[PDB]
Design a protein around this ligand. Structure first.
Ligand SMILES: OC[C@H]1O[C@H]2O[C@H]3[C@H](O)[C@@H](O)[C@@H](O[C@H]4[C@H](O)[C@@H](O)[C@H](O[C@H]5[C@H](O)[C@@H](O)[C@@H](O[C@H]6[C@H](O)[C@@H](O)[C@@H](O[C@H]7[C@H](O)[C@@H](O)[C@@H](O[C@H]8[C@H](O)[C@@H](O)[C@H](O[C@H]1[C@H](O)[C@H]2O)O[C@@H]8CO)O[C@@H]7CO)O[C@@H]6CO)O[C@@H]5CO)O[C@@H]4CO)O[C@@H]3CO
Ligand SMILES: OC[C@H]1O[C@H]2O[C@H]3[C@H](O)[C@@H](O)[C@@H](O[C@H]4[C@H](O)[C@@H](O)[C@H](O[C@H]5[C@H](O)[C@@H](O)[C@@H](O[C@H]6[C@H](O)[C@@H](O)[C@@H](O[C@H]7[C@H](O)[C@@H](O)[C@@H](O[C@H]8[C@H](O)[C@@H](O)[C@H](O[C@H]1[C@H](O)[C@H]2O)O[C@@H]8CO)O[C@@H]7CO)O[C@@H]6CO)O[C@@H]5CO)O[C@@H]4CO)O[C@@H]3CO
Lengths: 830, 830
């Protein structure tokens, strides 16, 4: 029962006896580490309690495998879920600090990139909160993806520093090490078994990150792998000879696996590295899982119970090698026969798809994979032949020519010969998505429309064969992190007006706000909370962008990966149009025509994506002029927040008035940031695409700003443009010409506008229809202007967004996964 | 006041809440870490108490700088000095372990190599025990020198694994980081000051190893440097392009500084690396020292008080760069004028010499040093010119031709032009030893004869100039580690018969054993203690060498660096002679002629020293035959203990009956292992050389086995051999021929014997006089045989060795350094 007193003693204790700094003074960094270690003490108690119960009881356990987890900062959520925010705040008060200052010392854990990773993270919170026996498995990336800086020249990339001192959270398990093999050869023994000898041998060591549940003792693990080699592999002979690099070579090759996330793969070395990362994740994870299965089993070890005890979820095609690897282990190591192993495999593994287009599903060079994982490629070839025989059986050999088409689309190997075709240099590839739909008992999309697109467009034939496999699991975000903790002002309101705090768990109770949406008292509280959140942001923007902005203005935010298809370019074009129209007006007219706005951009551009970077540069330049133009004042500000991450999101989302989700219609599978915006009472402007659809439905069409073409239209409108029919709006041309004038920039921008012109060519002819949708967009923004002027209306919309968000709780998503795929049951930790 | 109960709770606490292993079970490795962390809690309390007092009081502080510290295991000495051996033993009992088993888990800290490093370590124990305000400074080497393995083929080297899990002792100071610069250029500012810009920039981070004193709270620091670079220096551009090595390049170049000790320097890269290691040590240390001086000074900062507050001891020529660097800092950074800086420097720095020969004193390429440390080379040139003017002043310019000789020998630069010689391609070098004798206020040898050799032979001219500089400080070893803890059986005896335990501190009380040396009760206790110690060794030899040996036999040990000049070859030749003579005898005769012996060799050979390795191979082969020859049985065993280190020494020395110190007379400056042997009642066979002289004196000539030629003789006996006069003894020829017969080996050994033959040539003509001394040696060993047969006599000798060892306490040595060089006074920590 930790109180302010015990926590104070705890923090002091750690500062002295588990130091990572000099004894003098109690600065912020020291205070953070000591605080974090105090928190971790509690986490470990419950982690052990959970671990023990799970071990003794031997229920079925689920394992979520992902190449990214976007964990963010742990501190406030850890104390939050533990219900010690008050005690820790008081203890820090006693030590001459405040909670918010200490929490800001913590770096975001750079273990992921985007929604894929954040989904996994939200899931871990839900899994723990709901008492579900499940773990995450990932790689412990040293330098993350990259830290973004915004210079005069725009985006620059620099390696992450999050481990420079180290993580106070993680728990290294020195006794939890597993061998990983690469390269080498396969050979048959006199016993008839396959033996994969030789190659490179490395180790994978476990680091546990405890994940505590909300108002429970259930604390699960995010177990991360770090790759290394023994000290003995250091070549003294080389080093003493002066060949210092050559000496370090083995450990360098081993460790780089865990250096950065999504390493550049234009190079052969890059591709090899990627494949190693995947294999490392799959193999280390599986070995650890199987070890745990073997333990718990005691004397009797019934392998046919494996799927009744183990579920493995593959977050995207990255953990695909789980299928071949689990086969390899069950056959070569455990001695099972093909059918037994294949049964167990399928009943264990499941797949989640996040992609709309069939291109963008992972493929590998056959030669490359076969060189690196020879034994795996054997097992893949086998699995593929079994499929070829099952196709021929089912469809028969009466129609032909179509059967050939059904093989060409469904086969796991691409440009391969076939065993015995009745029938009468293109490169050979392995299709990982196909492998996933074959080796797994379940395939799910992340939104209702998306899941339908999986069954109808991408995996049509497989859907025909095995309808029972296909599912949907609409995405979610945790209300702990994304309401309760990131937005205390609002949380207080919800607790008041729903009459309880139960909503953090029973989030459907948000719907009870509907009936009060027009109440003037609630409206005032609501407007005050939103204003409060914006203050925190104003200082943030000051210190990070250099620009002073006012509250009392619409916060219009677009925070996501910089890509042409996300159409940051559309938003900023809208901003520049509005700017031009200002300017060509008197002061009095400006105030009557446009409401005050702070337009906030955020997100990272792929370093080698020339256009993406150009766009970031454009935005910063637009801001440069607008923000210093004295005729604009505090009517319009444009800022680009550097280094968008979970922490930034936790700051901006609570303070957001409008959020932009304006990707070319279709394209997006789901999206999650929109769900968090909605939860915080943000109003969304976006296309009919991804989760926008389900959100718009649940919040109400009147409380969402829809614009632009739709999924059905796109193909036709591209077939416009080509043929040479498309006519641009005059206002769009006006923006382009205003840019070319030099208005914002010594900087060129000709190659930027270039992408929007023409009717053919790669990287040209406005593929993403910024021009086409530009009209409906700026028109829609005028409507936003109107709504914002009517604060009674605007606030009602805000309230209804929060009231209709409850189904996007990740608790709902995980209840679904738990019951309909993994088949696991809650477990109480008294 | 920690008791068994609190310590038990402490160990349990750490096992759970500061884990580095999985929760399951309480194996040895986990138990060790938990135990060590419990110990460290106490160490930190007292480390802080000491730190605080030293800070407030602002006395003079001494800093011992060394490229090696041979710290060994910390556990038993830490609890020993804390006086908690009993409580920790009981606590571990309660947890289902025993102390000795836990302690054996700890790896020796691989931070040094030999006596040089061990001297430093002993000093740190004394310094703390005696309450002297002083720290050590060193490098935190990752892989030490190398771990020795003994194979069928002899010695193999493999990198040390001591940090593979990490040290439970060290305390990282993340806020204690100092910039180190390499390369770059110097340039003068408009203010007239020198500016060293550009080059490579790296960081040096402090790791504290607490060193507790015996029966005191004084806990000082061994502060180790680890070199690194910020995360930002990681080149993402390179890495994502596939150039994974090139990306890692900056951090690789920075970190390799702290990889291994004494890296091979045949290569240019090796030499550069060495120089970086030295500079890193000097610069990081000095910066930290100066920082501490600046602090403590408060507002008033009087640089002329620097030497009254700071002493810097240079252990050998490795920390030579302290002189140039301290000048650089005081001039360029602190703005002092040449004379002020030079005054302060000299009054701060002092030098310790460990070498007999003038060759073997460090020299550097001028071009190389000037490229790496340009600003330093400037300051060296200045210091040298000042010397050239002081020489000319003092000796005048009347004699000439001799004055030219006095410049040639004393100048710091070699093959350099002179400023204005009155007077009327050899490579340019920097003489580091010369620099040390100029920049320091004190120069000391490590033994009385050695110190005289410094003044007379090596630094004759400097002695003429500055007699006042030269001193002696005869070496010592700590009685804590090397009696009290490594030998409990004996410790109990000493406490009994001296009537108190005070001797651990007041070690002169060992002399009181003299009067009881012939007492039959003491003799029995003594013989029992020695036998007891040998049991521990028998199991050790079983598990490490594979050979079963009996107690009841003379333990005849030679443990030290394998080198021709140490003459392991002599010892083993003696063993092979004795073996041959056996064999050519009946069983009954063998027992009458030779006493049972276990002959134990230990030590490491330089990897590229062809002969040294051949010797190790020889010894192992001799053992192979002898130990399996059924006609020899337990009359003779020859073992080579692998991986000789502090722990091995702590095991073998207490169990030793005879110890061999048989280097070619002269050559050795001191030696310390002999002092530890003597302390444990070992009888020494050795030449009149190094510390053998002072030991032999103090223990009594009758209780030492002297043999072989002497320092005066050697030159004459080399001038024999050359000229072609030397006649070999027939028994020596008999050994050589017995080897050539193939007796021991398929292995060749022709190139081994080769070194002993001829009268001229590098690597030939028995330079180290194994042949010449062979007669007196085997004769002397026959005397050993005789003495061993007379157990009353033998035991008396043993007792008198311990009784006459007390002056070789490192407490005596440090009292001397403290009063006569550093001028520091004890400080009480209540
Ligand atoms: O400088 C840009 C890139 O130039 C490429 O170099 C030339 C090629 O060598 C040359 O052969 C020819 O290209 C051919 C291709 O070989 C064909 O495959 C292509 O076929 C179809 C196809 O269905 C498809 O490409 C489609 O194009 C769409 C595309 O489907 C959309 O996704 C979108 O493209 C985005 C893309 O999604 C996004 O990732 C981003 O891509 C950047 C990447 O850094 C990189 O892929 C690319 O590389 C260079 C490289 O030098 C050569 O590959 O750079 C882009 C930066 O823009 O942005 C793009 C933006 O478009 O939109 C396209 C719209 O076309 O339709 C094509 C039919 O055209 O047919 C082309 C025929 O031109 O020309 C290349 C250009 O000189
Ligand atoms: O294979 C052994 C080494 O061979 C060397 O290669 C040949 C040379 O190229 C060639 O020029 C000639 O060598 C010359 C030298 O150039 C002269 O300097 C030398 O001068 C004097 C000098 O006063 C001194 O060397 C002295 O020799 C003593 C020496 O003082 C003692 O210390 C001792 O030497 C030990 C040594 O201390 C120890 O470290 C260990 O050394 C090994 C090292 O790995 C390495 O130095 C050496 O390298 C090779 C290398 O290929 C060439 O340098 O290998 C040795 C392994 O033995 O052991 C030695 C053991 O002796 O004892 C010597 C006894 O001579 O006296 C010489 C006068 O001779 O004069 C020689 C003339 O031969 O021949 C070299 C041999 O082919």
């Amino acid at each position: 029962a930790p109180d302010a007193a015990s926590i104070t003693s705890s923090i002091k204790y750690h500062a002295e006896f588990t130091p990572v700094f000099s004894p003098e003074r109690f600065e912020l960094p020291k205070a953070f580490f000591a605080t974090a270690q105090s928190v971790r003490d509690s986490l470990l108690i419950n982690w052990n309690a959970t671990y023990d119960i799970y071990e003794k009881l031997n229920m079925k356990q689920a394992y979520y495998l992902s190449m990214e987890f976007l964990q963010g900062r742990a501190l406030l959520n850890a104390i939050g879920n533990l219900e010690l925010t008050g005690a820790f705040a008081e203890a820090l008060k006693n030590l001459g600090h405040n909670l918010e200052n200490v929490a800001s010392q913590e770096p975001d854990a750079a273990l992921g990139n985007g929604g894929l990773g954040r989904l996994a993270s939200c899931f871990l919170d839900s899994l723990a909160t709901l008492n579900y026996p499940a773990w995450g498995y990932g790689l412990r990336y040293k330098y993350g993806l990259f830290k973004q800086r915004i210079t005069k020249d725009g985006q620059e990339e620099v390696a992450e520093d999050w481990l420079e001192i180290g993580s106070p959270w993680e728990v290294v398990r020195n006794d939890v090490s597993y061998p990983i093999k690469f390269y080498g050869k396969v050979s048959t023994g006199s016993d008839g078994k396959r033996y994969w000898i030789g190659g490179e041998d490395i180790k994978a060591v476990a680091y546990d990150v405890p994940i505590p549940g909300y108002k429970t003792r259930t604390t699960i693990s995010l177990r991360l792998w770090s790759t290394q080699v023994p000290s003995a592999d250091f070549d003294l002979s080389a080093f003493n000879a002066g060949e210092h690099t050559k000496a370090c070579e083995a450990q360098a090759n081993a460790e780089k696996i865990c250096y950065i996330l999504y390493p550049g793969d234009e190079s052969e070395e890059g591709k090899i590295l990627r494949l190693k990362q995947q294999y490392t994740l799959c193999s280390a994870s599986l070995q650890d899982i199987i070890s745990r299965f073997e333990r718990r089993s005691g004397d009797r070890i019934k392998w046919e119970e494996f799927p009744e005890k183990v579920a493995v979820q593959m977050n995207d095609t990255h953990p695909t090698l789980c299928i071949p690897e689990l086969m390899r282990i069950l056959i070569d190591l455990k001695g099972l026969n093909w059918n037994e192993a294949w049964n167990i495999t399928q009943r264990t593994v499941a797949y989640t798809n996040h992609t709309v287009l069939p291109e963008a599903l992972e493929k590998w060079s056959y030669e490359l994979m076969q060189k690196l994982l020879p034994r795996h490629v054997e097992i893949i070839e086998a699995i593929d032949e079994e499929l070829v025989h099952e196709i021929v059986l089912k469809y028969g050999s009466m129609d032909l020519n179509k059967l050939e088409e059904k093989l060409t689309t469904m086969r796991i190997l691409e440009n391969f010969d076939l065993p015995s075709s009745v029938a009468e240099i293109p490169p050979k590839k392995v299709r990982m998505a196909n492998l996933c739909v074959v080796g797994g008992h379940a395939v799910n999309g992340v939104a209702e429309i998306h899941s339908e697109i999986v069954k109808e467009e991408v995996f049509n034939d497989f859907y025909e064969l095995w309808p029972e496999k296909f599912q949907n699991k609409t995405n979610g975000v945790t209300p702990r992190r994304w309401i309760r903790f990131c937005n205390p002002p609002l949380s207080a309101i919800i607790t008041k007006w729903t009459g309880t705090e139960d909503w953090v768990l029973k989030t459907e109770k948000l719907a009870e706000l509907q009936k009060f949406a027009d109440n003037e008292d609630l409206q005032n509280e609501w407007r005050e909370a939103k204003r409060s959140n914006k203050i925190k942001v104003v200082s943030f923007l000051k210190e990070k962008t250099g620009y002073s902005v006012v509250p009392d203005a619409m916060f219009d935010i677009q925070v996501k990966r910089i890509h042409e298809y996300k159409r940051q370019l559309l938003n900023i074009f809208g901003i520049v149009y509005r700017y031009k129209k200002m300017k060509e007006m008197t002061a009095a007219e400006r105030k009557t025509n446009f409401v005050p706005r702070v337009c906030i951009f955020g997100g990272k551009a792929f370093a080698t994506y020339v256009q993406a970077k150009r766009i970031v540069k454009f935005i910063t330049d637009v801001g440069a002029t607008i923000n210093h133009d004295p005729e604009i004042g505090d009517l319009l500000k444009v800022v680009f927040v550097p280094d968008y991450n979970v922490s930034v999101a936790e700051l901006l989302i609570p303070a957001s008035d409008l959020s932009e989700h304006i990707s070319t219609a279709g394209m997006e599978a789901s999206g999650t940031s929109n769900m968090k915006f909605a939860m915080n009472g943000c109003i969304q402007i976006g296309t009919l695409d991804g989760a926008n659809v389900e959100i718009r439905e649940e919040v109400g069409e009147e409380n969402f700003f829809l614009f632009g073409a739709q999924a059905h239209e796109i193909a036709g409108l591209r077939k416009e443009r080509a043929d040479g029919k498309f006519v641009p709006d005059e206002r769009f041309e006006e923006v382009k010409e205003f840019v070319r004038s030099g208005a914002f920039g010594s900087y060129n921008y000709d190659d930027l506008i270039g992408s929007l012109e023409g009717n053919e060519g790669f990287g040209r002819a406005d593929y993403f229809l910024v021009g086409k949708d530009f009209p409906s967009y700026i028109e829609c923004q005028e409507k936003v202007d109107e709504a914002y002027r009517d604060q009674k209306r605007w606030t009602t919309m805000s309230i209804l967004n929060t009231a209709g968000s409850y189904k996007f709780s990740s608790d709902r998503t995980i209840h679904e996964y738990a019951k309909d795929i993994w088949n696991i049951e809650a477990v109480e930790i008294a």
